[PDB]
Symmetry: D2
């Protein structure tokens, strides 16, 4: 019953991207981004436990993935500052969201898998 | 031009036409000051955003209005938009092409930077 | 200890791609593709149990994913006949391979995550 | 031309230059008969593979020699190559651009088909 999971993979090494910082924000009624949760990717490149079913109410959310630090630490100066995912959540009732990102120094892809528990 | 944006549609196998694109420059106060905008052409390209003089070093944001594009096609989208944030010109002036490949629940962006 | 897993996701629906046929082949000493394993993706879009550590000897392998049937069944005539992954395996000792594919009607991406148990 | 192939490098943020590409047509016996080939240009493009007359309906294979490209750059690659298999012209003649974005452990291909 974790309703939000983020998973990050490295397209160069063919590996999970470990220790990647992730910050999650929620758009406020006044229209600004309130901090909602944060964490770092595990060995498996996954970040669990960000939120709960109750807390994770309808809204617009932003997941910012600190790809730049991940590359810089490997000696690489990447193109992007970060990878950002912005989406409306739970608009038709609660769902479970997996936000997956695949990283290369000059490219990233992002895909959402959304399921109905 | 020093900056071009090009958008493709993975569902139809075509350029993504009439997609709104906004470009911003990060301000001293860490706000985004809007800088240039346009809509992609019938080839999915947006040219003429900026000039070599104007396009000085800094951190830039390209915001692509993916949601409106999908809505227009009658297809439900996941993302609000697709954003590309990058530092420009850090080693000199370059020509940047920002390319995006769009699916309703996924997108991929790549930069082709040539000097 | 499953050394080969294939995972397929649908970029249109934001879902696993279920019931996707997958065929695996191994290049023979005579240079032709011998059938090695086959299966279909589960509800979670994953296919496990293709092979074993002992069977999965060094070689060149091909994973063919029947994307066309997956789309056609949804009413869609897709661009690709299939998605094929060809790779050398276990060249430096045994590894565990996850072959992931993300599908759209006119595009697919494939990524390998390779780990050392 | 009715068929173009374009290859980009996600590691360097550049066109992938001097990449070998082979094109095949499926034969009656379900073998691949090699049809056209080339190497990508400094812009990552390969033009001139075929002509409208020659490019009749059928099933075609495009094989991109990704492995050699990475080897040349000194980077270890996962794939032997990247293949694109598709049926051409089923609704009429079209112009096909096959685009590939390459990373050492990943690739993505997309078709832009215009009539
Ligand atoms: O290995 C991958 C690659 C990743 C991915 C592919 C494409 C994309 O656009 C974004 C992420 O997809 C995945 C999604 C998963 O749930 C688990 C995975 O192991 C993987
Ligand atoms: O930079 C890119 C990436 C590429 C692409 C992205 C995703 C994918 O899955 C396959 C190809 O598309 C392009 C197509 C072009 O005409 C010019 C380009 O610069 C690009
Ligand atoms: Ca400059
Ligand atoms: Ca024809």
């Amino acid at each position: 019953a974790c309703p939000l999971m983020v998973k990050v993979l490295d397209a160069v090494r063919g590996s999970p991207a470990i220790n990647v910082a992730v910050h999650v924000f929620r758009k406020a009624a006044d229209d600004t981004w309130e901090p909602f949760a944060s964490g770092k990717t595990s060995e498996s490149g996954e970040l669990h436990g960000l939120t709960t079913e109750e807390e994770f109410v309808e809204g617009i959310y932003k997941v910012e993935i600190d790809t730049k630090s991940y590359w810089k630490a490997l000696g690489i100066s990447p193109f992007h500052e970060h990878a950002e995912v912005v989406f409306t959540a739970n608009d038709s009732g609660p769902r479970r969201y997996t936000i997956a990102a695949l990283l290369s120094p000059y490219s990233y892809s992002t895909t959402a898998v959304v399921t109905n528990p």
